[PDB]
Write an enzyme that holds these catalytic residues in place. Sequence first.
Site, PDB file in Angstrom:
ATOM      1  N   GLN A 136      73.099  36.555  59.493  1.00  0.00           N
ATOM      2  CA  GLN A 136      72.679  36.707  58.104  1.00  0.00           C
ATOM      3  C   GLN A 136      71.358  37.451  58.031  1.00  0.00           C
ATOM      4  OE1 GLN A 136      73.053  32.312  57.099  1.00  0.00           O
ATOM      5  NE2 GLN A 136      73.838  33.169  55.184  1.00  0.00           N
ATOM      6  N   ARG A 191      71.934  41.099  58.619  1.00  0.00           N
ATOM      7  CA  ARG A 191      72.405  41.768  57.416  1.00  0.00           C
ATOM      8  C   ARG A 191      71.266  42.037  56.430  1.00  0.00           C
ATOM      9  NH1 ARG A 191      77.883  41.034  56.210  1.00  0.00           N
ATOM     10  NH2 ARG A 191      77.358  40.818  53.997  1.00  0.00           N
ATOM     11  N   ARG A 238      67.634  32.947  46.480  1.00  0.00           N
ATOM     12  CA  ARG A 238      69.021  32.695  46.842  1.00  0.00           C
ATOM     13  C   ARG A 238      69.170  31.772  48.042  1.00  0.00           C
ATOM     14  NH1 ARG A 238      70.188  37.530  47.667  1.00  0.00           N
ATOM     15  NH2 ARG A 238      70.213  37.784  49.951  1.00  0.00           N
ATOM     16  N   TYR A 279      53.609  40.646  50.056  1.00  0.00           N
ATOM     17  CA  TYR A 279      52.321  40.491  49.394  1.00  0.00           C
ATOM     18  C   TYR A 279      51.473  41.758  49.482  1.00  0.00           C
ATOM     19  CZ  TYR A 279      48.350  37.918  47.479  1.00  0.00           C
ATOM     20  OH  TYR A 279      47.349  37.478  46.641  1.00  0.00           O
ATOM     21  N   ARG A 310      41.961  40.382  37.675  1.00  0.00           N
ATOM     22  CA  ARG A 310      41.590  41.293  38.753  1.00  0.00           C
ATOM     23  C   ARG A 310      42.608  41.347  39.898  1.00  0.00           C
ATOM     24  NH1 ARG A 310      38.284  40.730  44.034  1.00  0.00           N
ATOM     25  NH2 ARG A 310      40.500  40.196  44.363  1.00  0.00           N
ATOM     26  N   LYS A 327      51.395  34.900  47.374  1.00  0.00           N
ATOM     27  CA  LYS A 327      50.432  34.170  48.194  1.00  0.00           C
ATOM     28  C   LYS A 327      51.095  32.904  48.760  1.00  0.00           C
ATOM     29  CE  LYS A 327      45.910  34.306  49.310  1.00  0.00           C
ATOM     30  NZ  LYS A 327      45.181  35.535  49.745  1.00  0.00           N
ATOM     31  N   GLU A 371      43.013  32.847  42.811  1.00  0.00           N
ATOM     32  CA  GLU A 371      43.366  34.177  43.291  1.00  0.00           C
ATOM     33  C   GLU A 371      43.142  35.255  42.237  1.00  0.00           C
ATOM     34  OE1 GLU A 371      45.036  36.462  46.635  1.00  0.00           O
ATOM     35  OE2 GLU A 371      43.865  34.651  46.242  1.00  0.00           O
ATOM     36  N   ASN A 381      35.648  39.153  39.715  1.00  0.00           N
ATOM     37  CA  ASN A 381      34.511  38.785  40.562  1.00  0.00           C
ATOM     38  C   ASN A 381      33.525  37.761  40.009  1.00  0.00           C
ATOM     39  OD1 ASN A 381      34.996  40.438  42.941  1.00  0.00           O
ATOM     40  ND2 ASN A 381      34.546  42.186  41.604  1.00  0.00           N
ATOM     41  N   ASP A 404      40.135  32.363  47.972  1.00  0.00           N
ATOM     42  CA  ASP A 404      40.382  33.220  49.127  1.00  0.00           C
ATOM     43  C   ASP A 404      39.662  34.572  49.137  1.00  0.00           C
ATOM     44  OD1 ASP A 404      41.878  33.970  51.624  1.00  0.00           O
ATOM     45  OD2 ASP A 404      42.676  35.497  50.258  1.00  0.00           O
ATOM     46  N   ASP A 405      39.644  35.259  47.997  1.00  0.00           N
ATOM     47  CA  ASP A 405      38.996  36.563  47.909  1.00  0.00           C
ATOM     48  C   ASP A 405      37.557  36.496  48.412  1.00  0.00           C
ATOM     49  OD1 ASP A 405      41.233  37.940  46.585  1.00  0.00           O
ATOM     50  OD2 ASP A 405      40.679  36.825  44.774  1.00  0.00           O
ATOM     51  N   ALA A 447      27.258  46.185  48.497  1.00  0.00           N
ATOM     52  CA  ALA A 447      26.686  44.868  48.260  1.00  0.00           C
ATOM     53  C   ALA A 447      27.424  44.106  47.151  1.00  0.00           C
ATOM     54  CB  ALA A 447      25.203  45.018  47.914  1.00  0.00           C
ATOM     55  N   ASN A 503      40.095  49.170  50.805  1.00  0.00           N
ATOM     56  CA  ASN A 503      41.541  49.373  50.749  1.00  0.00           C
ATOM     57  C   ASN A 503      41.911  50.258  49.559  1.00  0.00           C
ATOM     58  OD1 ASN A 503      42.199  47.314  52.884  1.00  0.00           O
ATOM     59  ND2 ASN A 503      41.361  45.923  51.342  1.00  0.00           N
ATOM     60  N   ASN A 554      42.698  41.091  57.884  1.00  0.00           N
ATOM     61  CA  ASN A 554      43.592  40.467  56.914  1.00  0.00           C
ATOM     62  C   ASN A 554      43.295  38.988  56.662  1.00  0.00           C
ATOM     63  OD1 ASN A 554      45.926  39.642  55.385  1.00  0.00           O
ATOM     64  ND2 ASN A 554      47.009  41.425  56.219  1.00  0.00           N
TER      65      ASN A 554
HETATM   66  N1  LIG Z   1      39.546  41.411  54.475  1.00  0.00           N
HETATM   67  C1  LIG Z   1      39.515  42.617  53.925  1.00  0.00           C
HETATM   68  O1  LIG Z   1      39.924  43.518  54.660  1.00  0.00           O
HETATM   69  C2  LIG Z   1      39.006  42.843  52.511  1.00  0.00           C
HETATM   70  C3  LIG Z   1      38.878  41.714  51.638  1.00  0.00           C
HETATM   71  C4  LIG Z   1      38.404  41.867  50.317  1.00  0.00           C
HETATM   72  C5  LIG Z   1      38.059  43.171  49.883  1.00  0.00           C
HETATM   73  N2  LIG Z   1      38.177  44.257  50.700  1.00  0.00           N
HETATM   74  C6  LIG Z   1      37.785  45.640  50.195  1.00  0.00           C
HETATM   75  O2  LIG Z   1      36.354  45.732  50.066  1.00  0.00           O
HETATM   76  C7  LIG Z   1      36.033  46.745  49.087  1.00  0.00           C
HETATM   77  C8  LIG Z   1      34.930  46.235  48.154  1.00  0.00           C
HETATM   78  O3  LIG Z   1      35.363  45.043  47.473  1.00  0.00           O
HETATM   79  P1  LIG Z   1      34.505  44.319  46.338  1.00  0.00           P
HETATM   80  O4  LIG Z   1      35.342  43.121  45.703  1.00  0.00           O
HETATM   81  O5  LIG Z   1      33.166  43.726  46.995  1.00  0.00           O
HETATM   82  O6  LIG Z   1      34.170  45.369  45.216  1.00  0.00           O
HETATM   83  P2  LIG Z   1      32.776  45.196  44.515  1.00  0.00           P
HETATM   84  O7  LIG Z   1      32.784  46.007  43.130  1.00  0.00           O
HETATM   85  O8  LIG Z   1      32.489  43.646  44.211  1.00  0.00           O
HETATM   86  O9  LIG Z   1      31.620  45.780  45.478  1.00  0.00           O
HETATM   87  C9  LIG Z   1      31.393  47.189  45.730  1.00  0.00           C
HETATM   88  C10 LIG Z   1      29.942  47.412  46.204  1.00  0.00           C
HETATM   89  O10 LIG Z   1      29.808  48.750  46.754  1.00  0.00           O
HETATM   90  C11 LIG Z   1      28.745  49.441  46.074  1.00  0.00           C
HETATM   91  N3  LIG Z   1      29.060  50.897  45.984  1.00  0.00           N
HETATM   92  C12 LIG Z   1      29.962  51.611  45.188  1.00  0.00           C
HETATM   93  N4  LIG Z   1      30.110  52.939  45.238  1.00  0.00           N
HETATM   94  C13 LIG Z   1      29.120  53.187  46.265  1.00  0.00           C
HETATM   95  C14 LIG Z   1      28.638  54.412  46.913  1.00  0.00           C
HETATM   96  N5  LIG Z   1      29.079  55.636  46.650  1.00  0.00           N
HETATM   97  N6  LIG Z   1      27.692  54.368  47.860  1.00  0.00           N
HETATM   98  C15 LIG Z   1      27.155  53.205  48.217  1.00  0.00           C
HETATM   99  N7  LIG Z   1      27.446  52.001  47.760  1.00  0.00           N
HETATM  100  C16 LIG Z   1      28.483  51.940  46.697  1.00  0.00           C
HETATM  101  C17 LIG Z   1      28.616  48.756  44.709  1.00  0.00           C
HETATM  102  O11 LIG Z   1      27.326  48.894  44.097  1.00  0.00           O
HETATM  103  C18 LIG Z   1      28.879  47.298  45.086  1.00  0.00           C
HETATM  104  O12 LIG Z   1      27.712  46.636  45.588  1.00  0.00           O
HETATM  105  C19 LIG Z   1      37.378  47.116  48.394  1.00  0.00           C
HETATM  106  O13 LIG Z   1      37.847  48.420  48.771  1.00  0.00           O
HETATM  107  C20 LIG Z   1      38.309  45.974  48.800  1.00  0.00           C
HETATM  108  O14 LIG Z   1      39.676  46.388  48.777  1.00  0.00           O
HETATM  109  C21 LIG Z   1      38.630  44.111  51.968  1.00  0.00           C
END
Ligand SMILES: NC(=O)c1ccc[n+]([C@@H]2O[C@H](COP(=O)([O-])OP(=O)(O)OC[C@H]3O[C@@H](n4cnc5c(N)ncnc54)[C@H](O)[C@@H]3O)[C@@H](O)[C@H]2O)c1
Lengths: 599, 599, 592
Positions: A77, A80, A104, A125, A180, A198, A270, A274, A293-294, A327, A433, A477
């Site tokens: 199964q 398939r 199913r 996911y 978000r 999730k 989830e 922010n 988690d985020d 940051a 990402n 991840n």
């Molecule tokens: N485990 C993982 O692999 C994982 C988990 C969570 C998020 N992420 C990735 O991390 C990234 C950021 O996530 P986030 O939630 O903190 O977003 P966020 O908006 O909370 O943070 C972005 C930060 O980057 C800064 N920034 C933006 N443009 C910039 C530039 N040109 N130069 C310098 N600094 C700059 C911003 O001022 C801010 O402090 C995303 O791409 C997200 O997909 C990865």
Amino acid sequence: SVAHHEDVYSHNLPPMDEKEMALYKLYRPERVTPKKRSAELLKEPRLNKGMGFSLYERQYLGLHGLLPPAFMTQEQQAYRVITKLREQPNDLARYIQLDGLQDRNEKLFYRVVCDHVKELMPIVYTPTVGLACQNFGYIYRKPKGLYITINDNSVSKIYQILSNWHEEDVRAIVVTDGERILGLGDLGAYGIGIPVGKLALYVALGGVQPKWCLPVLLDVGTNNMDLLNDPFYIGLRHKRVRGKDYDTLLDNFMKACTKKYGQKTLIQFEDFANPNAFRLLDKYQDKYTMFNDDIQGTASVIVAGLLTCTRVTKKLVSQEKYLFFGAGAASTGIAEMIVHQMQNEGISKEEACNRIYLMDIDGLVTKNRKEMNPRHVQFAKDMPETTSILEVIRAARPGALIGASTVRGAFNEEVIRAMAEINERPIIFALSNPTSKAECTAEEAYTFTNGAALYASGSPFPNFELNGHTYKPGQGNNAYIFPGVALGTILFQIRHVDNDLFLLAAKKVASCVTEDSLKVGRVYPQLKEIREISIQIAVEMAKYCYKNGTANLYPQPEDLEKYVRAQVYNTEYEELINATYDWPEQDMRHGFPVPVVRH
Amino acid sequence: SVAHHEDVYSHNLPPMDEKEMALYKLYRPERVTPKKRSAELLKEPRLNKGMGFSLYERQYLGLHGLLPPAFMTQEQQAYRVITKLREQPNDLARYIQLDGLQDRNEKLFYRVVCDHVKELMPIVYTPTVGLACQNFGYIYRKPKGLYITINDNSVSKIYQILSNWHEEDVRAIVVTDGERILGLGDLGAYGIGIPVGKLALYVALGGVQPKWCLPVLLDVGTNNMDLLNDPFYIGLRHKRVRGKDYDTLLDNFMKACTKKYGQKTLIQFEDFANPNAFRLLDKYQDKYTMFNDDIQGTASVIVAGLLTCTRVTKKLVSQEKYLFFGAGAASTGIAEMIVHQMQNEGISKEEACNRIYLMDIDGLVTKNRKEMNPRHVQFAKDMPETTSILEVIRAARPGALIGASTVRGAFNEEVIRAMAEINERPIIFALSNPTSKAECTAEEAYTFTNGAALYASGSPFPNFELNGHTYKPGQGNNAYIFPGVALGTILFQIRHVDNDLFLLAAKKVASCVTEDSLKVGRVYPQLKEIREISIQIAVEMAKYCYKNGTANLYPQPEDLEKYVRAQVYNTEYEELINATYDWPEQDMRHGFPVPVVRH
Amino acid sequence: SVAHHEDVYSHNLPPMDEKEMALYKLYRPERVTPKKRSAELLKEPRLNKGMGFSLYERQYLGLHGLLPPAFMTQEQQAYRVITKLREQPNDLARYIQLDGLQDRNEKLFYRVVCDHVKELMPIVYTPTVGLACQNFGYIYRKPKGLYITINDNSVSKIYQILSNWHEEDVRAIVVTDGERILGLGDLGAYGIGIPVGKLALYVALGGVQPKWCLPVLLDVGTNNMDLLNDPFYIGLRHKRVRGKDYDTLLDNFMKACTKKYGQKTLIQFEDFANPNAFRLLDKYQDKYTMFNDDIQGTASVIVAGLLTCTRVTKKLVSQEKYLFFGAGAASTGIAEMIVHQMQNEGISKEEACNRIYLMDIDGLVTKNRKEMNPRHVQFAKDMPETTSILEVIRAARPGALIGASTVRGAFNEEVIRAMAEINERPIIFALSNPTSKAECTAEEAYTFTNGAALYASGSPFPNFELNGHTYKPGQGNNAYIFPGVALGTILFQIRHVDNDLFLLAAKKVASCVTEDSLKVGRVYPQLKEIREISIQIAVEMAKYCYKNGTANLYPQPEDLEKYVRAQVYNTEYEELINATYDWPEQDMRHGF
Ligand SMILES: NC(=O)c1ccc[n+]([C@@H]2O[C@H](COP(=O)([O-])OP(=O)(O)OC[C@H]3O[C@@H](n4cnc5c(N)ncnc54)[C@H](O)[C@@H]3O)[C@@H](O)[C@H]2O)c1
Ligand SMILES: NC(=O)c1ccc[n+]([C@@H]2O[C@H](COP(=O)([O-])OP(=O)(O)OC[C@H]3O[C@@H](n4cnc5c(N)ncnc54)[C@H](O)[C@@H]3O)[C@@H](O)[C@H]2O)c1
Ligand SMILES: NC(=O)c1ccc[n+]([C@@H]2O[C@H](COP(=O)([O-])OP(=O)(O)OC[C@H]3O[C@@H](n4cnc5c(N)ncnc54)[C@H](O)[C@@H]3O)[C@@H](O)[C@H]2O)c1
């Protein structure tokens, strides 16, 4: 039927010591016979085996004639499903297929998803789920989640909604207000797929019992103007409510959930926006069995990669210096976590924060700042303001560079060159990402470091080969952490999940990186090993929690590992027909035990 | 339906402070709508109201036409039951009637039993229940209990039996092997009525939720030779099994029960043969949420009477001397409990035991003894052997005489005369049951003491009048303790019930004796006050347990008394139809939110 | 499981020829697996075997642990039931125990009633059921009937009430308004026990399947002032509505029942006030599959008694003269049925009616009457006006005297002696119930006749020995006819039940009276033989109805009797678990 001197379903077992036997009987899963028959049973995902049902099973349960006259093993199964999966036109079609499979035949679903975890995790996911919510709009499916809105604001109204859910033994809830959705933004009522996905991983990767899972979506409106103009949108039609009412809804929600299923119910947030995500986490962290988690998942996943890198840079986390390019949520959380760890390494919260540098859109985070985040304060450095990565790299000469900023290729050849110069083996993480947003690629990181860099990214990159040596870059991840943290929190009824627990998890993940995986640049174990890792994390969380008295499961099980392995989900088909057993022949007789004269 | 600004079922409520309102909403019982309709619903005791169902309710739930065209209030229904109850020929017929009522309309049952608690408590349980088991043999009724035999010996086999029980939320189990049914002896499989009756009191007198109760009967055979010759006996036909097998059955039983419903499940042993009862209690007391009422219940009931007497003899329990005529289960248990108490009164286990004298069939319990019970040892006295009560009364001049020996009238005029001489107000308890086995009667105790004695018996005696003063002797009914102890143990998930808790309960019962009840010779509160007493005991057990960390309910509720009152059973009929409520008019509209052009 | 070359549940079958096997497989009852488990199954009378469930069944169906650890045979359970029954203080107490049994284990209930028919029939129905309704008032029991009131007066309101019933395949309904419960009168809503009891005999005596039965009581109020004044009465607290509203309620009832279960649904009226009984019967007789036992059943059983008498008086029903003392619902009905019988024997409605003499409270029925009953008229004689039976017995010298009038001992020695004188074997029937109201006892009938009388009554009389010869007088119990008439009507979907069929039922009962029972003076079959009698009646009914095209069951079954026997209720426990069977070894294999 079994003999009178035998036990039920205790055939062909491994040689066991009398004491070993008792513990086994005490912990083992017991058979559960369903109440439904015929079509009503075939329509129950948790019971339906499809053509996997044998002919005897079909006749017995009133299924015969309702399925085609062919009989299959679960492997056949799964075969398939896999074949048909790969013949699909795109990833979205595969998502739709797998969602249908979950509704199913649940055993087959997790069987398939677990066997090809690397190939399907991004479908179930990771990135496909959100794309599906956005592109399909309302997706047809069985009722696999609950919608609780701002118009159902009260303990009672939410209680009644939870009461409409078919399972009474809920122990794990994943909620979202869909403001978000990872990499898409406000998708409103269309986000129901996120909690579903999730939870699917909780089971597939954590071993969490599916019956214990409940996907929830809070609908307080939406700010996505397209949806409000969309004549097909099925969510509440108005911008998001944010007053005290929003705060009350979440309060009543946490109350209603625990009032219904009990205070030990794990509630995980989830894809919240922010700001809300951090506040909410701060408001409930010590009042409920909750976690985001985020925020914490991310923090823990990364720290685990940095901790694994420690085995190469021969420098402890507290004997290192980190430079975060970005940051925001991800970076800030990972920092504070790196600090906690450092303090647990025999250091103060002074020399700790002083070893971490943060760069935001407005360059470096110094002290002469105006209107900065209160969390950044303790990390701000008393140095010269600058926007150059290279300049910051040169001044502080960090040991590891972590990228968590939207900017693609923000880690240019020079920046990578610099990191190598200052460090024999430089740590470079491109987390943004998808890969098209990565601060730099695997190829770039290795080549521009002559193959000495320690690279990890948020999205999957192809394996690179440099100078005859092969490299298999990893991915930070979250799936490496939350499954295990969820399992352990549930089985032992941990009252509250704190940073320490997440740290324990990270250290566990790191400890599972093989020496071979390390000789190929992999700072993360293989995705297929997450189930075993999750079990290990659960056991570790137990020891630690029974030691500080936060584990509510009473009493502490004799053998932790055995108790956990007996609790995890099993993708194998189980018997649905009661097991029968003999009684002493004399006691099984029908008729007067003592003769009487007939009337 | 309710307005959009109102909550469901929140009409006509008492003025409430915003903070008071929230706590109320958090604790209050929520409405639960049933899944059954028509006849299937009428046959569910927990849902069926009989003619108490209004016409709208009948039409809605598919009941219309299945009940006679008359409508009744619950009071009217309770009236009809009471009338018919009193027209019955004997107590056994009333028992049969009430058993039938419990299986027809549970709300009406507990309504009736609670309103006439004094008049029906001895019917539902006390002495009539055992008479019924013995005389009717197998009694026709709905499946209100489980039979688990020595041939179902294994965690799995018992687990499967428990799985056949219709309720999944079991929190209180009363078990018996029916070897020692109070005042009848080995009745075997016919004893199923005992657990049923006891649980009925948990609900009627304790406020314990009926859905949480499960009656169990362990059948390991029977030694009652009549039954084994009885062609109608429905139990296993052979003498009782007693080897390791018996020990294993109970072990698997406790395991299976907790494995199924959880470690916090309250398991109480009833009517076991004395020796077994003590052993079993000793083996599980600290490993499970268990307790044996015959032993600990008795001990606690009596101590509560002695403690209430303290308010008259102006002498503390540790400033008193007790003489037990009889040294069996009851007496021995009450002694050890009196000791514990004394030690909690700032004394040692030396001067404590030295204040208690025990007499058995072989006279006083001295030290020159041969082959005596290990529990009697610490009470044996270094004095002259004698069989005369009067002689022992004269030597030690006790402060209170307690009778727990089969012997009727063992407390003759002289013995009562002596007690009065040595004490201004002598404590005399005639516990042997029934009244025809009493060491002496109320009339005898008062008259031969000129009305100064403090009397309490195990069976009910008529109120006496002496020299113009009226006396209303009490009864040391266990029902004063176990209900409350059960409630508190369940609501707060106390890990283990120890003597201290029983003592706390006794002290609570005593504290509830009014000054009026005390001016009539009553050392026990009125039976109708057991529900309120039970609640008080539950709250007291909470404070004490959260203080020493044995209460598992996390977290400790804000307001203990309010939380408990919201948890107790309510005999009033509840609504079975979902409550409806409006949403903002605009959001309740059916139709495209944004116009489209028709296809 | 069974082999791939074997059919399910076909082991240990009698030798059969290819064709015989086919017809057996086509007619045989098939297994039906329930959907309930555990306590829910144990609570279904039709599925519960109680301790009769084996250990395996209990483990399979999730019953284990819910029943005591003993295992019984159905025989052993019946034994326990009969023991407890005979130990009861009185019949009322026996009634209550049987009602509880019907609600606990249906198969056992019928096994017991069917085995001890003569002993229990009067407990389940006959005379005890009416006493239970009157004395107990509201009785505690499972929902085994439906109350439909004057307040639920519309096709839809009744449809919704019928929709609340637990079985969809209803085929027989017994309805009453409780105004005239036999021997007690108006018991209002307390009368629901009558239909229940009547349907119980349908099953026990007729073999009708229990699931097809639906007991109903129409509550339009009551004129029993005691009930109206009784604070414990559970019916509509007002007197009986009789306007257009009543008739409208009945018309809606008939519509709703047939709309709900089909035009073929058999609806039998019981214990209605005589006027409503007759009026309603006359109104629905040819519009629905309906009948009224008190009227036609009575008429039929008595004619069967007379027919049996023919074998001893060597006189045909038409070559006879009958004298009815009392011309109420009972006599008038029997008269008309006798007439109908005479016509079917070759004569006309002239000699017929001229062979029947009716008497009421105001003496004989003379054409010089004033304000008489329309039905009576055609029987009124153009002779002198007398009041003495003797003066009538001596005038028209009838060959049979039939008593159906409250009056006890109305047939005195002089009356009987006069019959024995005019007839070698005079026919003396004292129908009035109970015994304490019988026109004359048997000891009297036989004595004042010299054991030469052919006697029967409505109530039982002990066996009487006279001059060495023993006598075992029989009772004209309606139970000899309605069970079979019902079985036949249902199984063959007979559109309407008429005189011809009841007469046919009458002739079958008569033909089953053995020679030995006749020598002992018993003109009715043994009660224990009713099930077989019912089966033969249905067969005979089928033959008659197919010939005249009134049987809707299409096509006529090949072997009427084999078909009928295959359809009747079986008191034996049946397997509840699915029968399993193999497929070719290669076609059951799992895998590619
Ligand atoms: N485990 C993982 O692999 C994982 C988990 C969570 C998020 N992420 C990735 O991390 C990234 C950021 O996530 P986030 O939630 O903190 O977003 P966020 O908006 O909370 O943070 C972005 C930060 O980057 C800064 N920034 C933006 N443009 C910039 C530039 N040109 N130069 C310098 N600094 C700059 C911003 O001022 C801010 O402090 C995303 O791409 C997200 O997909 C990865
Ligand atoms: N709360 C209550 O009111 C309550 C509770 C439990 C038991 N009881 C009653 O207490 C009584 C004893 O119960 P038990 O379980 O301890 O029985 P038991 O067999 O365990 O104890 C009886 C004791 O009395 C002694 N004894 C017997 N005949 C005697 C005689 N003639 N003279 C002196 N001593 C004698 C025995 O040696 C033994 O020590 C019973 O009548 C029982 O119904 C009352
Ligand atoms: N299967 C049976 O055995 C069977 C069936 C039906 C009726 N019965 C019995 O037949 C009797 C009458 O039945 P019914 O339904 O016709 O009641 P009914 O009220 O309709 O008939 C009474 C008739 O008797 C006449 N009558 C009354 N008192 C009289 C007197 N003193 N002298 C002369 N004539 C008198 C009345 O005028 C009337 O014609 C009852 O006792 C009933 O139990 C027996």
